[PDB]
DNA sequence: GCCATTTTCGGCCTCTGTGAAAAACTCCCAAAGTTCCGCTATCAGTTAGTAAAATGAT
DNA sequence: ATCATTTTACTAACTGATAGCGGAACTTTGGGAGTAAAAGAGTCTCCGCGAAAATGGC
C-alpha cells in the first residue's frame, strides 16, 4: 500500500480480502462472546468460509467478489497462475538490465 | 519428430505386478520400471511386465515427475494440489526448474557442472 | 451488524412504554450499520466523526451546487459550514479510496498499474560504489596521519566501528582529558584541509 | 514444454535396436531419397552389399556425404540406423542414437538440448503451413 | 555525462572485442538471437548485415531489434563460440545453409 | 532506447518497462528457449539472476565491473521468493531441502 | 608549479612563521633567493634549509636557481 | 583479433568444454597475475585464451596440472614458514 | 486537492530526416532510410540533375 | 545451497512457526500520520520496521542499536527488507 | 458404457494513471498532540598558563 | 657536544549556543453510548466463444 503522485494510494486486492476475513472472524468471535442465536452464528461461519475461499481462489466457489471497479478481486491463486501469473511473467521470462 | 515421439512414449501401465513395488492398473514412468527390472534381474527375482502408453504432448507435459515444470506449463491449481497431497519432491533435473530457481541449466556449459555435483552427491551418500 | 444491533435493542427494550418493538429496534440497527460502514468500508480507516464531517460536507456541496448551478468553492463551503477554510481543505484531501494495482492502464487490458510503480527505497549501485570509494579514500587519507589523530578521528566519527563516541570516551583510552582530544581533532581537521592531501576527497562533494 | 528435458547425456548406450530406413515411395516415383534420410545417422547393423556378404559400411559410423555417395553408387535399398526413440539411455539420449547435429555438421556433443531444437524446428514453419 | 572525446576513445576500446547480442521478436528459433561484434556508427538505428535477415525474418520496413550486453567472461565466450553469426550458417532444422 | 541500471519494480524487484520509465527489454520464454538450444547456460544465468532480480548479485556485479573483475556470484531471484511466500500463503508448505 | 602562494609548499610551522616575515611570496620568488638569503635569517637553519630544498626538489627546483620569471 | 572459432574447437573437440577452459584462462589472466603465453596484440583476455588454445599451449590438462602444482607449492611453503 | 501550483512549459523541436526514419508512399511501399548519400554520389541524367 | 524442493500440507504448528505475530485488526495505516497501525495488516511489530534501522517511536534511529527491540513499540531495529520475508 | 455439466486454453515486441452515486446527530470522557519552560549534556570558539620537546646558535 | 629559545603537549576557565529530555496545562482528536409513531424478504444485469478433456449421474 504505497502512495502515488498527488496523494493517491495504490493497494492490492489481497489487502481487501484479508480485511474481509479479519472483520468476519472478529464478528464471529464477538457473536460467540454474546451467546448469539444459532442462525446468526451459522451465517457468520458461512461468511467466514466464503471470505477464506475468495482470498485463496476467487470465483471457484461461486460469484466472484468485486471491489469498487466492478471487477473481480485478484487472489493468491490468480497471482501464481495464468499467462500473467508469476511463473510465466516473472520467472520464465524477465525484463533485464544492460539492454536496449 | 522422433525426439517428440520419444517424449510421448514415456509412460507404461503395469500388467504383471511381479515382486516390484508396482500395482496393476498403475501408470508409471518407463525409466523407473526399466531400472527396477534391471535391479530385480540382478537379484534373480521376477521382473515386471508393462504395456507402453501413448500420451499427447499436453498430457505428457502435465505428467512429468517434477511439479515445478508442470505448474509452470498450465493448470497450476491441479498440479499444486496433487503435489501437496502426495508430498512430491522436485529434484531440479530439467531446464525449466533450474531456470526458475536461477541455477545453471543441465545443458551445454552447465552440463559438466551438474555432473560434478551428482558425483559428489553419490560420493557423500556412500 | 444489524443483527447485533437488534440483539442490543432486545437486551434493552421496555414494553411498558406502549410503543412497538420496531420503533426502538430501528434506531439500534441503523446505528450498528452506520458505525460498521464508518469503521470497515475503507482501506485507510477514517474515524466515525470525520466520516460524518465528510458526509455532511458532501450534502452541503450537493445542496449548494443545486442552488447556484456550479460546483461550490472551498471558501463558500467554509462559510456555509461555519468552519475554517483550512479545515475544509484538510477534509477534502482525505476523502480518497486507494486505487487497485490490477487496474488496466489506458485502453490496454494486459497492462496493470502495479507494473509502473518503482521501489524508491532501493540504493542505486552508483551510490553504493561511491560509498565504497569514499571508504577507501578516507582510509587512504587517514593513513597519512600519525596513529593518534587518525584513531581520534576514527573514534569520534565511528569509522570502521559500530558506535560514535563523545570526547570523554576518546580521552579515556589515551588517559588524556577532553580538551586535548578537542584540539587533536582540530589539528587533524586543519591538516586534512590542506589541498596537498584533500584533492581526492573533494570530488565526493 | 513436452521436450525440454531431452539432453544428450552419454556417448553410446550400447543398444542393438534401431529403425529401418527405405526410400519414401508414394506411387511410381520417389518422393525423398534414402541419402537425404540417412545423412547424419549412425548405422545400427552393417550395410552389406546386395547379393554379397561384404561389409561395405561397418557399425557405428556416421553417414556423411562420402558414405552417402558410396551408398548411392552401390545402390543399397534398405538400411537400419539408430534412433532416439529406440535409445537405451535412462535419462535423455546418447550421441550415437541421435547422430549428426545439423547446425554444426559433426556428431552431437554432450549436453546439447536437442529437445528444444526439435520443438523449435517443428514449430517455426507453422506460420507457413495452411496401375500401369 | 559531458561526452568528452576521451570518453569516446574509452568506449571504442571497451567494445573492441566485446560481443553483443541481437534479438528480434518473435524468437521462433534459436537463430533469432545472435552474437555480433559492435561497430560504432553515427546515428540512432542498428545496422544489420543483410545475410542474417533470413535468419531473423527481418525486413527494413520499421522493424525493431533488441540488444543485450554479456557481462561475465563466461557469457562473452559463450557468445563468441556458440552464438556468433559466423558459427550459425547452417539451419538446425535441416542442415541447409541459412545465410544464402 | 538503452538502459544500464535504473528504476526497479516494487514487488518483483525487476527493471521497469518502457522508454518513459528508462526500462529494460524483456527476455521472454522464447529467448530462454533459444539460449537453452544454444547451450548458453552462463548467459541465461546472467539474464535471470544478476540482470533482473538478484538484489545483492546485481550490485556485486556492478562493483565488480567497475573494478575490472568481470565475474558474478549468482543468487536466488526475488521472484522465486515471492512465489514461495505466495504458496505458503495458500496454506501449502513449500520448502527448499538441503 | 607557477606563481602560487607559499602555503602550498606545505612548509612547517617554524619554516612558515620565519618566512612569514614577508621576505617572500609565491614559489617562483622563493626559488630565486639562494642560500645567501636562506641562511641569512637568524631563524632559518640547517633543518629548515634541508626541508625547503626537499620541497623544491619535489617541485623539481633548487634554492638559488636563476630564472627570468 | 580473431573470428570464426574453428581451430579452437578442432583442438578441443567440444564447444562447451572449450568455452569453460577459455573462461578459466581468461579469469587467470584478468583477475589473477598470470601472463599470456602469446603476444597480446591488443586483445582482450577471452581472445588471448582462445588463441592460446588454438596454438595448443592451453588445455584442461595443463590448467588442472598447474593448479594442483600451485596447491602443492603453497602447502610446502606454508610448511616452510 | 493538495496541488499548489502547476507550471507548464512548451518545447518546439525541429526533427530532421535521418537514417532509421520510416518513409512511405500511398501504395503501401513503406521503408526505413538507410543512408543519407551525398549529392555527388546520386545517379544523374544527361542534364546533370541528380 | 539447496538440492530439492519439498511440497506438502501445512500444519497449524508449522504456520505458527512461520508467523512472527498475529494480525488482530484490519487496520492498515493511519489516515493522518500514514504510519502502520498496531496489530494490523502492516504492523511494524510483526513484519518489521518501515525505515532502515529505525523504530516507529524514533528513539532508536541508528545502527548501533541493531537487533534491539524498542520497549515503547516493540519494533526490532533492522532492515526494511525483512518486510518481504516476515 | 453413455450423457451432461465443469474446466481450462487460446503468438512475440512497443506505448499506455484511474473513476466519476449513495443520506445523521448529540453528549460525555479520556488520551494523544501542541506549546512552553526548566534542567542538563555536548560542542565550537577563545584565551591563559605551565611544563617539556624541538630546534638553532655557538 | 651543549645551551637558550620557540613551539608543542597538556590543564583550566569563560562565552555562547544548541539540541534533547521531562513536567504542567491546554486544546484537539478519537472512541463509546444513545436516539421510543412505525418502519417488519436482494441483487440485478447478462446472455454476441469454441473445442477438447476430465469428472459425476444413470
Ligand atoms: Mg516488417
Ligand atoms: Zn542411444
Ligand atoms: Zn520505539
Swiss-Prot record, chain D:
Transmembrane segments: none annotated. Zn(2+) 2 binds at residues 13, 87, 94, 97. It comes from the Bacteria. The RNAP catalytic core consists of 2 alpha, 1 beta, 1 beta' and 1 omega subunit. When a sigma factor is associated with the core the holoenzyme is formed, which can initiate transcription. Belongs to the RNA polymerase beta' chain family. DNA-dependent RNA polymerase catalyzes the transcription of DNA into RNA using the four ribonucleoside triphosphates as substrates. This is DNA-directed RNA polymerase subunit beta'. It comes from Vibrio cholerae serotype O1 (strain ATCC 39541 / Classical Ogawa 395 / O395). The gene is rpoC.
Swiss-Prot record, chain F:
Disulfide bonds: none annotated. Belongs to the RNA polymerase beta chain family. The RNAP catalytic core consists of 2 alpha, 1 beta, 1 beta' and 1 omega subunit. When a sigma factor is associated with the core the holoenzyme is formed, which can initiate transcription. DNA-dependent RNA polymerase catalyzes the transcription of DNA into RNA using the four ribonucleoside triphosphates as substrates. This is DNA-directed RNA polymerase subunit beta. The lineage of its organism: Bacteria, Pseudomonadati, Pseudomonadota, Gammaproteobacteria, Vibrionales.
From Swiss-Prot, chain G:
The keyword Protein transport does not apply. Residues 1-69 are annotated as: Alpha C-terminal domain (alpha-CTD). Keywords: DNA-directed RNA polymerase, Nucleotidyltransferase, Transcription, Transferase. GO terms for cellular component: cytoplasm; DNA-directed RNA polymerase complex. One of its GO terms (biological process) is DNA-templated transcription. GO terms for molecular function: DNA binding; DNA-directed RNA polymerase activity; protein dimerization activity. Homodimer. The RNAP catalytic core consists of 2 alpha, 1 beta, 1 beta' and 1 omega subunit. When a sigma factor is associated with the core the holoenzyme is formed, which can initiate transcription. DNA-dependent RNA polymerase catalyzes the transcription of DNA into RNA using the four ribonucleoside triphosphates as substrates. Belongs to the RNA polymerase alpha chain family. The N-terminal domain is essential for RNAP assembly and basal transcription, whereas the C-terminal domain is involved in interaction with transcriptional regulators and with upstream promoter elements. This is DNA-directed RNA polymerase subunit alpha. It comes from Vibrio cholerae serotype O1 (strain ATCC 39541 / Classical Ogawa 395 / O395). The gene is rpoA.
UniProtKB/Swiss-Prot annotation, chain I:
Signal peptide: none annotated. DNA-dependent RNA polymerase catalyzes the transcription of DNA into RNA using the four ribonucleoside triphosphates as substrates. Belongs to the RNA polymerase beta chain family. The RNAP catalytic core consists of 2 alpha, 1 beta, 1 beta' and 1 omega subunit. When a sigma factor is associated with the core the holoenzyme is formed, which can initiate transcription. This is DNA-directed RNA polymerase subunit beta. The lineage of its organism: Bacteria, Pseudomonadati, Pseudomonadota, Gammaproteobacteria, Vibrionales. The gene is rpoB. The chain holds residues 1044 to 1093 of 1341 of the full protein.
Amino acid at each position: 500500500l504505497v502512495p502515488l503522485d498527488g496523494g493517491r494510494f495504490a493497494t492490492s486486492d489481497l489487502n481487501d480480502l484479508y480485511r474481509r476475513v479479519i472483520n468476519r472472524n472478529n464478528r464471529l468471535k464477538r457473536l460467540l462472546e454474546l451467546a448469539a442465536p444459532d442462525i446468526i452464528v451459522r451465517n457468520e461461519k458461512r461468511m467466514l468460509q466464503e471470505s477464506v475461499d475468495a482470498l485463496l481462489d476467487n470465483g471457484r466457489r461461486g460469484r466472484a467478489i468485486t471491489g469498487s471497479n466492478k471487477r473481480p478481486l485478484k487472489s493468491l491463486a490468480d497471482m501464481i497462475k495464468g499467462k500473467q501469473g508469476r511463473f510465466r511473467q516473472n520467472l520464465l521470462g524477465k525484463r533485464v538490465d544492460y539492454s536496449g | 519428430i522422433e525426439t517428440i515421439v520419444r517424449q510421448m512414449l514415456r509412460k507404461c501401465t503395469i500388467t504383471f505386478a511381479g515382486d516390484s513395488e508396482f500395482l496393476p492398473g498403475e501408470t508409471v514412468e518407463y525409466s523407473q520400471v526399466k531400472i527396477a527390472n534391471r535391479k530385480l534381474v540382478e537379484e534373480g527375482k521376477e521382473p515386471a511386465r508393462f504395456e507402453r502408453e501413448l500420451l499427447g504432448i499436453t498430457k505428457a507435459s502435465l505428467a512429468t515427475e517434477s511439479f515445478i515444470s508442470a505448474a509452470s506449463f498450465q493448470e497450476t491449481t491441479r498440479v499444486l494440489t496433487e503435489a501437496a497431497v502426495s508430498g512430491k519432491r522436485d529434484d531440479l533435473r530439467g531446464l525449466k526448474e533450474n531456470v526458475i530457481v536461477g541455477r545453471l541449466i543441465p545443458a551445454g556449459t552447465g552440463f559438466a557442472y551438474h555432473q560434478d555435483r551428482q558425483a559428489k552427491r553419490a560420493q557423500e551418500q556412500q | 451488524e444489524g443483527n447485533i444491533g437488534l440483539m442490543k435493542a432486545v437486551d434493552k427494550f421496555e414494553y411498558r412504554r406502549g410503543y412497538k418493538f420496531s420503533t426502538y429496534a430501528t434506531w439500534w440497527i441503523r446505528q450498528a450499520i452506520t458505525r460498521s460502514i464508518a469503521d470497515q468500508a475503507r482501506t485507510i480507516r477514517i474515524p466515525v466523526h470525520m466520516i460524518e464531517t465528510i458526509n455532511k460536507l458532501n450534502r452541503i456541496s450537493r445542496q449548494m451546487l443545486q442552488e447556484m448551478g456550479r460546483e461550490p468553492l472551498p471558501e463558500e463551503l467554509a462559510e456555509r459550514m461555519q468552519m475554517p477554510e483550512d479545515k475544509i481543505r484538510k477534509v477534502l484531501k482525505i476523502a480518497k479510496e486507494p486505487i487497485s494495482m490490477e487496474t488496466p492502464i489506458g485502453d490496454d487490458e494486459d497492462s496493470h498499474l502495479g507494473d509502473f510503480i518503482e521501489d524508491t527505497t532501493l540504493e542505486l549501485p552508483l551510490d553504493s560504489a561511491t560509498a565504497t570509494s569514499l571508504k577507501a579514500a578516507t582510509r587512504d587519507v587517514l593513513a597519512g596521519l600519525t596513529p593518534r589523530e587518525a584513531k581520534v578521528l576514527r573514534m569520534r566519527f565511528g569509522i570502521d566501528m559500530n558506535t560514535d563516541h563523545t570526547l570523554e570516551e576518546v580521552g579515556k583510552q589515551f588517559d588524556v582529558t577532553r580538551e586535548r582530544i578537542r584540539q587533536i581533532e582540530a589539528k587533524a581537521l586543519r591538516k586534512l584541509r590542506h589541498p596537498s592531501r584533500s584533492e581526492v576527497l573533494r570530488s565526493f562533494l | 514444454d513436452v521436450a525440454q528435458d531431452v539432453v544428450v547425456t552419454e556417448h553410446d548406450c550400447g543398444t542393438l535396436e534401431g529403425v529401418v530406413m527405405t526410400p519414401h515411395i508414394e506411387g511410381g516415383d520417389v518422393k525423398v531419397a534414402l541419402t537425404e534420410l540417412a545423412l547424419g545417422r549412425v548405422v545400427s547393423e552393417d550395410i552389406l552389399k546386395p547379393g554379397t556378404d561384404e561389409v561395405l559400411i561397418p557399425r557405428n559410423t556416421l553417414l556423411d556425404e562420402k558414405w552417402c555417395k558410396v551408398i548411392n553408387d552401390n545402390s543399397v535399398d534398405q538400411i537400419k540406423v539408430r534412433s532416439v526413440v529406440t535409445c537405451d539411455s535412462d535419462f535423455g539420449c546418447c550421441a550415437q542414437c541421435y547422430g549428426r547435429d545439423l547446425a554444426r555438421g559433426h556428431l552431437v556433443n554432450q549436453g546439447e538440448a536437442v529437445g528444444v531444437i526439435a520443438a523449435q524446428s517443428i514449430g517455426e514453419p507453422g506460420t507457413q503451413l495452411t496401375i500401369q | 555525462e559531458r561526452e568528452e572525446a576521451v570518453v569516446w576513445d574509452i568506449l571504442d576500446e571497451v567494445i573492441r572485442e566485446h560481443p553483443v547480442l541481437l534479438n528480434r521478436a518473435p524468437t521462433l528459433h534459436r537463430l533469432g538471437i545472435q552474437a555480433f561484434e559492435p561497430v560504432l556508427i553515427e546515428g540512432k538505428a542498428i545496422q544489420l548485415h543483410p545475410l542474417v535477415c533470413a535468419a531473423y525474418n527481418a525486413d527494413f520496413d520499421g522493424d525493431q531489434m533488441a540488444v543485450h550486453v554479456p557481462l561475465t567472461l563466461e557469457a562473452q565466450l559463450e557468445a563468441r563460440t556458440l552464438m556468433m553469426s559466423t558459427n550459425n550458417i547452417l539451419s538446425p532444422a535441416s542442415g541447409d545453409p541459412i545465410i544464402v | 532506447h538503452a538502459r544500464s541500471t535504473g528504476s526497479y519494480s516494487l514487488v518483483t524487484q525487476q527493471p521497469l518497462g518502457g522508454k518513459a520509465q528508462f526500462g529494460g527489454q524483456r527476455f521472454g520464454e522464447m529467448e530462454v528457449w533459444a539460449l537453452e538450444a544454444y547451450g548458453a547456460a552462463y548467459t541465461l544465468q546472467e539474464m535471470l539472476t544478476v540482470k533482473s532480480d538478484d538484489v545483492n548479485g546485481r550490485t556485486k556485479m556492478y562493483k565488480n565491473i567497475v573494478d575490472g573483475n568481470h565475474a558474478m556470484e549468482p543468487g536466488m531471484p526475488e521472484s522465486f521468493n515471492v512465489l514461495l511466500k505466495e504458496i505458503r500463503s495458500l496454506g501449502i508448505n513449500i520448502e527448499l531441502e538441503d | 608549479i607557477l606563481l602560487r602562494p607559499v602555503d602550498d609548499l606545505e612548509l612547517t610551522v617554524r619554516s612558515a612563521n620565519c618566512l612569514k616575515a614577508e621576505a617572500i611570496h609565491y614559489i617562483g620568488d622563493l626559488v630565486q633567493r639562494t642560500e645567501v638569503e636562506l641562511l641569512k635569517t637568524p631563524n632559518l637553519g640547517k633543518k629548515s634549509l634541508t626541508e625547503i630544498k626537499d620541497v623544491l626538489a619535489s617541485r623539481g627546483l633548487s634554492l638559488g636557481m636563476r630564472l627570468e620569471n | 583479433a580473431r573470428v570464426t572459432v574453428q581451430d579452437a574447437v578442432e583442438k578441443i573437440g567440444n564447444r562447451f568444454d572449450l568455452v569453460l577452459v577459455a573462461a578459466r584462462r581468461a579469469r587467470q589472466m584478468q583477475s589473477g597475475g598470470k601472463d599470456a603465453l602469446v603476444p597480446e596484440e591488443n586483445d582482450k583476455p577471452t581472445v588471448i585464451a582462445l588463441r592460446e588454445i588454438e596454438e595448443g599451449l592451453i588445455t584442461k590438462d595443463v590448467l588442472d596440472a598447474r593448479e594442483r602444482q600451485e596447491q602443492q607449492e603453497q602447502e610446502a611453503a606454508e610448511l616452510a614458514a | 486537492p493538495g496541488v499548489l501550483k502547476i507550471v507548464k512549459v512548451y518545447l518546439a523541436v525541429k526533427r530532421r530526416i535521418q537514417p532509421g526514419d520510416k518513409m512511405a508512399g500511398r501504395h503501401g511501399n513503406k521503408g526505413v532510410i538507410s543512408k543519407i548519400n551525398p549529392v555527388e554520389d546520386m545517379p544523374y541524367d544527361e542534364n546533370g540533375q541528380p | 545451497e539447496f538440492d530439492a524442493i519439498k511440497i506438502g500440507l501445512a500444519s497449524p504448528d508449522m504456520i505458527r512457526s512461520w508467523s512472527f505475530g498475529e494480525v488482530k485488526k484490519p487496520e492498515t495505516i493511519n489516515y493522518r500520520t500514514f504510519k502502520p497501525e498496531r496489530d494490523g495488516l502492516f504492523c511494524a511489530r510483526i513484519f518489521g520496521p518501515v525505515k532502515d534501522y529505525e523504530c516507529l517511536c524514533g528513539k532508536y534511529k541508528r545502527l548501533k542499536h541493531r537487533g534491539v527491540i524498542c520497549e515503547k513499540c516493540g519494533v526490532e531495529v533492522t532492515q526494511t527488507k525483512v518486510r518481504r520475508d516476515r
